[PDB]
Design a binder for this molecule. Structure first.
Ligand code: FMN
Lengths: 897, 259
C-alpha cells in the first residue's frame, strides 16, 4: 500500500510501507504540522522544495522526534532510507545526486536548503541505522580515487594554513552541524585532549580566558568568543588543525574507507605552514585507530606552537590613527602578516629594503612565504609593516591612471597589498625564540612523529625535499618550518599532478584558489574538498562532489594548454605536409596568413598572387571609396585565381563611411553567391549587437577581429560566448611590428588573457607584431615564448606576416621603396618603445590623420611629419597660425625639398 | 593639416608621381621589429611564405616525430573534423548487417549535425567530403551544400549505404515513403574517379516510371576548405532531359533542337 507525505504543491513523493499503517498514520500526523507553510514557490529555508527534500526531512522527523519504541523507529527509518536509496539516487551517492539537484531549473533550491534538508537528514538516518559502520558495503565506487589508485590520474593532497578566512570557526560550526554523526567521535576527544591533558596542566595559563569548551560552542553560537579571541594563536592553531582533520574524516566516511585506504590512492600530501603538521598524519595514518592516535598528536603539536608562540611575541594594539588609516585605504586591521600580490619579486625586494634601512635590526620585515611569482606575504611588526604600506601607497596607480591610452611614461604600478588575518609573525625572527622551548616540550610527551611509518612522501616547505628521507627529528623539523623557515611554495609543489585536493580551512578562499594561477595551464584541477557549492560553471577549481563519482567518464580534468594546442603535422595522400593547427584546420591551408594592409594588399594582382601560393589573405577596404570599384576589384581577384578559392575582406571600424557601403556590399555579394569567405574588422572591436549582424546576416565562414586593448579582448569573448559555433578569429597585434599601435606591451595582456581566451573553444588566436622568418615565430606556434616569464606553454593557432611581405615580387610597392625597407634595420621585441624619441634603425612614429601613433620608415618626409606634429600640428586654434607665420619661409623650403 | 596628412599612402606604390622619384619624401609604413633580414628583395610570394612553412615542418619532424617522416598521420584530404564519437543519436535504427547499413530515422528531429556524421563516417573518402562539406563551388561561387537538403533527416526516411566502410564502390541510397511504399528517392555513387554522381529520382511521372536527375560533381582532395565542385558544363540540359521525360512520356524522344 502507498503513503503520501505531500507539502503544498508537490504531492508526488510516495513511499510504500507495510499494511500495518496505524504506526505510519500516527507518524506523519505530527510531521504534517512539523514543517512550515508554503512560501509561494518554496522560498523558505526550513521548507522542502524538491521531491527528495520532502522524503529526507520526513526521515529527519522520525529520527530526531523519536516518540515510539526503538524497534519501530529503527524500522521506519530504514524504510524511508531504502525507498530513497533505490528510487532517487541509484548507484550514485548523495552529494553527487545533490550536485545535479542544486542546478535544477524546474526546482529552484539553494545551498542552505539542500544542506539542511537533504544532506544533514540523510546522515542522521545513516547514524541510527548501521551504528558503528563496520558492514554493509553500499558505498559506490568513487571513480576519481579509483583512477588515482591505478591509472593516469595521480592525486595530490594539499592542506591550508592560517589567514585564509577570518571567521574560520564557522567552518567547524558548519561541518559539526551537517555531519554531526560523523565528526563527533573526534571533536569530543580533541576537546578532551586539549582541556583535560594540556590546558589544565601547562606551566601557566591566563591566555585561555573563556575556556576551551569546544562542543558547547559549536551547537550554541551565543557561547562562542567573537572573532578576536578565536583568531588568537593559542586557540587558532589547534582549531585549524581540527578543521582539516575533520575534512579528512568526513571524506573518508562518505566513501566508507579507512584513512589508509584513501592513502594509497594518492601521493604528495604537503601543507602550507600550519597544515604541514596535518600533512604528516595523513601520510602516516593506517587505520581508523592509527589515525586517531596520530591525529591527537597533531592537536598536541599545534597546542604547543600556539601557546609558546604567544609567550614570545604577544599580541599588541596599534594607535587607532594607524588602524583607521589602513582600514579606510583598502586594507584590513594591521596584523603581523601583510600579503603583497601582483607585484614582481625584484621590485618588492627593494621596497622592503628601502624600509628596512630606516629601522632597527629587531624591527625588520622579512619575506616570510612565496606563494607564487606575483604572490608573496611579508612578515614583521605590525607598526613596521604599516611602514612600507605607506611607501607602497605612493607608488600605486589610482583607478583612472590610464596607461592604456598613454604608453609607458608613468611609473605607477598596478598591484594590491592587504593585511592577512593572522595574529602572529610566522616564519620570521620574531617567533624563532620559541623553538627550543617547544622541542624540549614536545620531548616531554610522545609527540615525536615516526619518520618511517609515513608511506606517502611529504614535501618540505622550505626546500621542497621529501620528509621521509630526512635525517633528524621530524617533529623538531616541523616547528622549524613554522616558526623561522621561509615557506617556498613553488618548489614545495613542483610535482606532476592531474588533480589536487585541498582540505583547507578556507574552502573557496583556501590554498586552492589562492595558488591556482601558479599552475594554470599545465593540467592540474584543484578540488576544494570541504564545501559542496554545486554551482561551478567555470572550470578553474572543482568542488567536493568531484572527489567521488560513479562513472569514470565524468571526471572533469584541467586544460593542459601544451597538450591540447600542440602543433602537429599531417600528410595528405599526395605528399603535402601541413602543420595541423586550429587555424590551419579552418582554412585547409598553412597556419600563416597575410592581413589587410592598406597600401599593399589593395591591389587585386597581389592578393591573387598570395592566394595562388596556398595562403590566406584579405584585400583591404581602406584603399577603396565606392562599392562599385571595390566589387570590380574583388572580381579581379577571382579571374586570375583558380576556382574554389576564397578571399577575405578587411574593413576599418574607425570610419562609419566605409561601413555604410562595405557591410551591405558583402551581404549583396554573399546571397548572390561569391567566394568572399572572411571579414576582419580592423582598428576596433564592434559591439555585441552590431557584431551579430555580421555573423548571422552575412554568409561569412569566419570573422576576423583585431583587439588592441585588454577590454577589447574581453569584448571579443562576449561576442564568442554569444554563439559558440562560429569561428571568431582573434588577431592579436601588440605595439611593436604593426603600422598602428595597441598602445601597450605585446605579450603582457595575452599573458593574462590566455586562460580566458582558450575557454572559448571557437576563438582562434593569431600572433602578429613583426615576424619574418621560421625561427622568429616558432616559439609562438609551440608556446615556448612564455617560458621566459615563468609561465606555462601558451601556443598560438598560427601567425600573420605584415611588413615582411611588402618587399615581395608581386607586391605593387615601388622598387626604390622596396630597398628602403631592406636598408631599414630592425629592433628586438623589447626595445620598440623608443620610436617616439629616436629613429630605431630608421623607424619613428607620427600622429595619424585622426591622431594615432602610426609607424613609418624614418625618411625625410616623415621627419618633417614628425617635426610639424611637435611644433605646429599639436597647438591650439590661436597659437597655430603665428607658428605657421613664424616658420612660413622655413616650412616651404622643407615641403619643396 | 588637411593638405599635409591626407591620402598619403599611395606614393610608395608608384613613385614616378612624386617629385624626382625621391623615395625619401614618401611615407612607408613599417613596424620596428622584423627588418634585419630583408636583403633578399624582389622574391616571389610562394618563396617568402613557403620557406617559413617548410622551416616549421622541418623543425617539427626532428622534434615530435623523432626525425622520421613515416610517423606523420597520413590523411586523404585536409580540413576540419568535428567530434561525434559516441553513437547515441536520438531517433535512429542503425543496423550494420554484413556491408549494408540501414539508417531508418524513427521519430522527432535528430541532431542534423550528428546525422551527417553517421551518414558519412569513420574514413576520409569522397563520401565524407561530400556529406560534411560546408561549401559547394558553382564555378567560383560558394553556395550551400546540396547534401544538407537532399539528405536532411525527415520523418520515416531511410538510407542504405552499401560498402561505405570498405572502398570506392560505395552506393548510398536514400529511400522515402510515397503512397505507403518505399521508393528510391536519392542515390549517390562515385562514377570514375574524382567524380561523384548524385541522382535525385521522382516516381510520380507522366508514364508512371521513375526518372532520375543525374547531377555530377568534382572532388579535389588538394583543397579542404571547398573540396566539392559541381560540373556545370552541361547540367542545364541534364535538367531539361529530366523534365522532358517527367512532363512528357519516355516514349517521345527528348527534343531540344526547336526553333
Ligand atoms: C603597410 C601596412 C599597412 C597596414 N594596414 C592595415 C590596415 O589597413 N588595417 C589594419 O587593421 N592593419 C593594418 N596593418 C597592420 C597589420 O594588420 C599587422 O598588424 C602588421 O602588419 C604586423 O606586421 P608584422 O608582421 O611586420 O609584425 C598594416 C601594416 C602595414 C605594415
Amino acid at each position: 500500500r502507498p503513503l503520501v507525505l505531500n507539502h503544498g504543491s508537490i504531492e508526488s513523493t510516495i513511499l510504500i510501507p507495510t499494511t500495518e499503517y496505524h504506526f505510519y498514520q500516527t507518524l506523519l500526523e505530527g510531521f504534517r504540522k512539523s514543517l512550515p507553510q508554503v512560501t509561494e514557490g518554496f522560498a523558505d529555508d526550513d521548507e522542502p522544495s524538491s521531491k527528495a527534500e520532502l522524503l529526507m526531512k520526513f526521515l529527519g522527523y522520525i529520527v530526531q522526534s523519536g516518540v515510539s519504541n526503538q524497534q519501530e523507529q529503527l524500522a521506519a527509518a530504514k524504510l524511508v532510507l531504502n525507498e530513497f536509496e533505490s528510487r532517487f539516487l541509484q548507484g550514485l551517492n548523495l552529494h553527487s545526486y545533490a550536485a545535479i539537484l542544486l542546478k535544477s531549473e524546474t526546482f529552484p533550491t539553494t545551498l542552505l536548503k539542500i544542506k539542511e534538508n537533504l544532506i544533514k537528514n540523510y546522515y542522521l538516518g545513516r547514524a541510527l541505522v548501521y551504528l558503528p559502520g563496520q558492514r554493509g558495503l553500499v558505498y559506490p565506487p568513487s571513480a576519481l580515487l579509483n583512477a588515482g589508485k591505478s591509472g593516469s590520474a595521480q592525486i595530490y593532497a594539499i592542506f591550508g594554513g592560517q589567514g585564509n578566512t577570518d571567521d574560520y570557526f564557522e567552518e567547524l560550526r558548519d561541518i559539526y552541524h551537517i555531519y554531526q554523526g560523523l565528526v563527533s567521535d573526534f571533536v569530543t576527544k580533541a576537546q578532551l585532549k586539549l582541556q583535560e591533558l594540556i590546558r589544565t596542566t601547562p606551566e601557566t595559563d591566563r591566555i585561555y580566558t573563556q575556556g576551551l569548551d569546544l562542543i558547547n560552542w559549536l551547537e550554541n553560537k551565543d557561547k562562542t568568543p567573537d572573532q578576536q579571541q578565536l583568531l588568537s594563536i593559542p586557540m587558532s592553531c589547534p582549531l585549524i588543525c581540527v578543521i582539516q582533520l575533520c575534512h579528512y574524516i568526513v571524506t573518508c566516511r562518505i566513501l566508507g574507507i579507512t584513512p589508509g585506504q584513501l592513502r594509497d590512492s594518492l601521493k604528495g600530501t604537503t601543507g602550507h605552514s600550519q597544515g604541514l603538521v596535518t600533512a604528516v598524519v595523513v601520510s602516516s595514518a593506517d587505520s581508523w585507530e592509527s589515525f586517531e592516535k596520530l591525529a591527537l598528536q597533531a592537536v598536541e603539536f599545534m597546542f604547543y606552537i600556539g601557546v609558546r608562540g604567544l609567550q614570545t611575541y604577544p599580541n599588541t594594539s596599534l594607535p587607532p590613527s594607524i588602524v583607521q588609516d589602513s582600514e579606510e585605504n583598502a586594507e584590513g586591521t594591521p596584523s603581523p602578516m601583510l600579503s603583497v600580490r601582483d607585484l614582481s619579486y625584484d621590485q618588492l625586494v627593494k621596497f622592503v629594503n628601502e624600509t628596512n634601512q630606516h629601522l632597527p635590526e629587531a624591527k625588520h620585515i622579512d619575506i616570510s612565504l612565496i606563494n607564487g611569482p606575483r604572490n608573496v606575504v611579508l612578515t614583521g611588526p605590525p607598526q613596521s609593516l604599516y611602514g612600507l604600506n605607506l611607501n607602497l601607497r605612493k607608488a600605486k596607480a589610482p583607478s583612472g591612471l590610464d596607461q592604456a591610452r598613454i604608453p609607458f611614461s608613468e611609473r605607477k604600478l598596478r598591484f594590491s597589498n592587504r593585511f592577512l588575518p593572522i595574529m602572529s609573525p610566522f616564519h620570521s625572527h620574531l617567533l624563532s625564540p620559541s623553538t627550543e622551548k617547544i622541542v624540549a616540550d614536545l620531548k616531554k610527551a610522545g609527540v615525536e612523529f615516526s619518520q618511517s611509518s609515513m608511506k606517502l612522501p611529504v614535501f618540505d616547505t622550505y626546500d621542497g625535499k621529501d620528509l621521509r628521507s630526512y635525517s633528524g627529528s621530524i617533529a623538531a623539523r616541523l616547528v622549524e618550518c613554522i616558526t623561522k623557515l621561509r615557506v617556498n611554495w613553488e618548489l614545495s609543489t613542483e610535482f606532476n599532478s592531474t588533480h589536487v585536493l585541498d582540505f583547507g580551512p578556507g574552502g573557496a578562499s583556501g590554498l586552492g584558489v589562492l595558488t591556482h594561477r601558479n599552475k594554470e595551464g599545465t593540467g592540474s584541477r584543484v578540488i576544494v574538498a570541504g564545501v559542496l557549492d554545486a554551482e561551478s560553471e567555470d572550470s578553474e577549481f572543482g568542488y567536493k562532489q568531484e572527489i567521488f563519482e560513479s562513472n569514470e567518464k565524468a571526471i572533469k580534468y584541467a586544460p593542459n594548454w601544451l597538450k591540447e594546442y600542440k602543433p602537429k603535422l599531417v600528410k595528405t595522400s599526395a605528399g603535402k605536409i601541413f602543420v595541423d593547427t586550429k587555424f590551419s584546420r579552418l582554412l585547409g591551408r598553412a597556419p600563416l596568413m597575410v592581413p589587410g594592409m592598406t597600401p599593399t594588399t589593395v591591389s587585386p594582382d597581389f592578393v591573387a598572387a598570395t592566394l595562388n601560393a596556398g595562403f590566406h589573405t584579405e584585400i583591404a577596404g581602406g584603399g577603396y571609396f565606392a562599392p562599385s570599384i571595390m566589387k570590380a576589384a574583388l572580381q579581379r581577384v577571382i579571374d586570375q585565381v583558380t576556382p574554389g578559392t576564397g578571399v577575405g575582406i578587411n574593413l576599418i571600424y574607425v570610419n562609419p563611411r566605409m561601413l555604410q557601403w562595405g557591410i551591405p556590399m558583402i551581404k549583396e555579394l554573399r546571397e548572390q553567391g561569391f567566394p568572399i569567405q572572411s571579414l576582419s574588422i580592423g582598428a576596433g572591436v564592434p559591439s555585441l549587437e552590431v557584431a551579430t549582424e555580421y555573423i548571422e546576416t552575412l554568409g561569412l565562414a569566419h570573422l576576423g577581429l583585431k583587439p588592441g586593448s585588454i577590454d577589447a579582448v574581453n569584448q571579443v569573448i562576449t561576442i564568442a560566448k554569444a554563439h559558440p559555433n562560429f569561428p571568431i578569429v582573434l588577431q592579436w597585434t601588440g605595439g611593436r611590428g604593426g603600422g598602428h599601435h595597441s598602445f601597450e606591451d605585446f605579450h603582457q595582456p595575452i599573458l593574462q588573457m590566455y586562460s580566458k581566451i582558450r575557454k572559448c573553444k571557437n576563438i582562434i588566436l593569431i600572433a602578429g607584431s613583426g615576424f619574418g622568418s621560421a625561427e622568429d615565430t616558432y616559439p609562438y606556434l609551440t608556446g615556448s615564448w612564455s617560458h621566459q616569464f615563468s609561465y606555462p606553454s601558451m601556443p598560438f593557432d598560427g601567425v600573420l606576416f605584415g611588413s615582411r611581405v611588402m618587399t615581395a615580387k608581386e607586391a605593387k610597392t615601388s622598387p626604390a621603396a622596396k630597398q628602403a625597407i631592406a636598408d631599414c634595420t630592425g629592433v628586438d621585441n623589447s626595445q620598440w618603445e623608443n620610436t617616439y624619441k629616436k629613429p630605431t634603425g630608421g623607424i619613428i612614429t607620427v600622429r595619424s590623420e585622426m591622431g594615432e601613433p602610426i609607424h613609418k620608415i624614418a625618411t625625410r618626409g616623415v621627419m618633417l611629419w614628425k617635426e610639424l606634429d611637435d611644433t605646429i600640428f599639436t597647438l591650439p586654434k590661436n597659437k597655430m597660425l603665428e607658428a605657421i607665420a613664424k616658420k612660413k619661409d622655413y616650412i616651404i623650403k622643407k615641403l619643396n625639398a | 593639416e588637411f593638405f599635409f596628412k591626407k591620402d598619403s599612402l599611395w606614393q610608395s606604390e608608384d613613385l614616378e608621381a612624386v617629385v624626382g622619384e625621391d623615395v625619401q619624401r614618401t611615407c612607408i609604413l613599417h613596424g620596428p621589429v622584423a627588418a634585419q633580414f630583408s636583403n633578399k628583395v624582389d622574391e616571389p610570394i610562394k618563396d617568402i611564405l613557403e620557406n617559413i612553412h617548410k622551416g616549421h615542418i622541418k623543425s617539427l619532424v626532428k622534434e615530435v616525430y623523432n626525425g622520421d617522416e613515416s610517423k606523420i598521420p597520413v590523411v586523404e584530404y585536409f580540413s576540419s573534423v568535428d567530434s561525434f564519437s559516441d553513437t547515441a543519436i536520438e531517433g535512429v535504427k542503425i543496423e550494420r548487417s554484413r556491408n549494408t547499413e540501414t539508417f531508418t530515422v524513427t521519430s522527432g528531429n535528430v541532431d542534423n549535425q550528428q546525422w551527417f556524421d553517421l551518414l558519412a563516417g569513420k574514413e576520409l573518402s569522397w563520401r565524407r567530403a561530400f556529406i560534411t562539406a560546408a561549401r559547394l563551388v558553382q564555378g567560383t561561387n560558394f553556395v550551400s551544400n546540396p547534401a544538407h537538403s537532399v539528405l536532411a533527416p525527415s520523418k520515416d526516411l531511410v538510407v542504405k549505404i552499401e560498402n561505405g566502410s570498405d572502398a570506392k564502390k560505395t552506393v548510398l541510397t536514400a529511400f522515402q515513403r510515397v503512397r505507403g511504399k518505399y521508393v528510391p528517392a536519392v542515390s549517390l555513387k562515385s562514377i570514375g574517379d574524382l567524380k561523384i554522381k548524385l541522382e535525385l529520382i521522382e516516381t510520380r511521372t507522366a508514364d508512371k516510371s521513375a526518372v532520375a536527375l543525374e547531377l555530377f560533381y568534382n572532388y579535389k582532395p588538394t583543397d579542404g576548405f571547398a573540396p566539392i565542385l559541381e560540373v556545370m558544363e552541361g547540367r542545364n540540359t541534364s535538367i531539361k532531359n529530366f523534365y522532358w521525360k517527367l512532363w512528357f512520356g519516355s516514349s517521345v524522344p527528348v527534343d531540344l533542337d526547336f526553333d
